[PDB]
Design an enzyme around this catalytic site. Sequence first.
Site, PDB file in Angstrom:
ATOM      1  CG  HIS A  37     -30.888 -52.825 -73.437  1.00 47.73           C
ATOM      2  ND1 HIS A  37     -32.100 -52.207 -73.443  1.00 47.73           N
ATOM      3  CD2 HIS A  37     -31.584 -53.763 -73.870  1.00 47.73           C
ATOM      4  CE1 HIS A  37     -31.946 -52.084 -74.753  1.00 47.73           C
ATOM      5  NE2 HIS A  37     -32.782 -53.845 -74.869  1.00 47.73           N
ATOM      6  N   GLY A 148     -27.948 -45.003 -75.965  1.00 51.89           N
ATOM      7  CA  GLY A 148     -27.066 -45.750 -77.251  1.00 51.89           C
ATOM      8  C   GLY A 148     -26.902 -44.697 -78.335  1.00 51.89           C
TER       9      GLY A 148
END
Lengths: 261, 259
Positions: A37, A148
């Site tokens: 994150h 991601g």
Amino acid sequence: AMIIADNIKQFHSIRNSLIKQQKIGFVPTMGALHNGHISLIKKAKSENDVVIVSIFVNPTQFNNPNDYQTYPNQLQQDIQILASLDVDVLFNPSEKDIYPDGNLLRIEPKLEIANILEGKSRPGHFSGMLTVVLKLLQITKPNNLYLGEKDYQQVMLIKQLVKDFFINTKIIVCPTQRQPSGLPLSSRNKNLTSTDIEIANKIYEILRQDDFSNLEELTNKINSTGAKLQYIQKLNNRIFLAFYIGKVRLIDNFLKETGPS
Amino acid sequence: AMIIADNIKQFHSIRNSLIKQQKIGFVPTMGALHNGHISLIKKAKSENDVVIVSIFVNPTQFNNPNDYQTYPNQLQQDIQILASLDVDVLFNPSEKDIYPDGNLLRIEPKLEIANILEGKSRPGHFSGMLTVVLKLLQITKPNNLYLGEKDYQQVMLIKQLVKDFFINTKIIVCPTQRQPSGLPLSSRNKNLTSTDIEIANKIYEILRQDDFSNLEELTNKINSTGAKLQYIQKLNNRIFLAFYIGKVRLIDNFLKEPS
Ligand SMILES: Nc1ncnc2c1ncn2[C@@H]1O[C@H](COP(=O)(O)OP(=O)(O)NP(=O)(O)O)[C@@H](O)[C@H]1O
Ligand SMILES: Nc1ncnc2c1ncn2[C@@H]1O[C@H](COP(=O)(O)OP(=O)(O)NP(=O)(O)O)[C@@H](O)[C@H]1O
Ligand code: PRO
Ligand code: PRO
Ligand SMILES: [Mg+2]
């Protein structure tokens, strides 16, 4: 100084405060924040004037109910993590604000890349993620969005989504953050016991030097460590896999030529 | 004075050249304009500084192929009509424009109101329409959307769609325009023959007197006209029906007490 919009109404007011002359990055998450994150956020902070992070655990993308209840949450820590990165706005709605009427209108993908790998493995997961990500984009109206590489098909699917729906946003795909072993950071890694991390790290020993030449042999190795290898496959230069250790489920994909790490 | 934009890029530069102080109404259509369509547009011209009408026949909403081949094109006549209305922008794209990669992502409804009536008799259709309307709205970004009460379910569905997807546009519902007989103005009507057209009006003279107390009987009455009735029902205060005359497929809804 970080603002927190607990519901849409709050968030709307914040959102309609900003000019168009300026750059809004958006990183969506289910919270339980880790270094993966954090990398997306940092990059967002480097490229944008305002950074919005959302934390919502979307029910409709969990095909496994026990997974849903099992899912880690620590919000007070996530807020502290988020405020130490100088994130501007945390959007953190409830199910009721995302789905006032329940889930009556859904994005249903029909594409090849949707019927394989994660798509075959978690039925309806993609519908749900696509439905929420559409709603989140509509609400946050960002210039830039950060995702991601870890969830590869997720990225493809969201790329098609923003195209097909005429949403004006750049998608930036960030590289997967890993442990030294090569094991990708995952929120569900919090749920694994010491015994499991051992196994997990063993798996990655195996992956770190392996040919990928013979896939049936590798499965056998991995299955032998006590984890259940779910799928493993080659696409172009890239390997994909999913497996269980205990009741914790983990996915990974990396370039065949180089990886993991 | 009317800009005709046959593709997205052309259309965008137009969309984003407009001021906030200007209100944009949008009237989506499948072309083959009649007075029903006009009524919507006359209402958009009255409430807006800019009116956008689109003509796109969306392949994705058609659950019958021949219906799609059948479907009427008067493009030039439509341009004319739209011009003597002084419509600002005509957006009429191609399939490549709207579905650059094919139809990959669909809006799929799960609610009862998408499982009944038109929803049963037109499988796939509501998903088709919802997807295109979502695209159309995402592209036009208007203040005001104008829909006919004639497609009642669709209206309900688009009201959901707008609220679920956080699009700020008002929905304005407009009353069904009818022939004197009471038959609703419709594009597919341009496919009725001269006798088929008279069968329609018979059907509507029958509807003009019924207390709707017996539907099987109302049904046999409609069918005796040569028509083939697909369904008819009361839900709340209203009748919904659809029927065939030959190949042509028509629908209606109105208060129990089609004027
Ligand atoms: N190790 C990582 N490196 C880079 N990005 C990641 C990593 N892990 C997650 N992300 C991204 O962060 C965003 C949020 O992931 P998240 O929604 O929180 O749920 P998850 O993928 O199901 N469990 P988790 O592994 O923590 O992501 C997505 O864009 C992810 O791809
Ligand atoms: N007779 C009518 N009176 C009022 N509004 C109408 C009427 N017919 C259609 N509309 C509306 O005009 C918009 C465009 O309709 P359209 O694209 O032509 O699809 P449709 O239902 O197949 N129309 P049609 O085939 O002409 O009956 C929709 O909002 C319709 O509900
Ligand atoms: O819908 C979701 O939750 C996925 C997770 C990362 C961002 N998008
Ligand atoms: O334009 C369309 O795609 C159909 C007809 C009007 C609303 N939905
Ligand atoms: Mg998470």
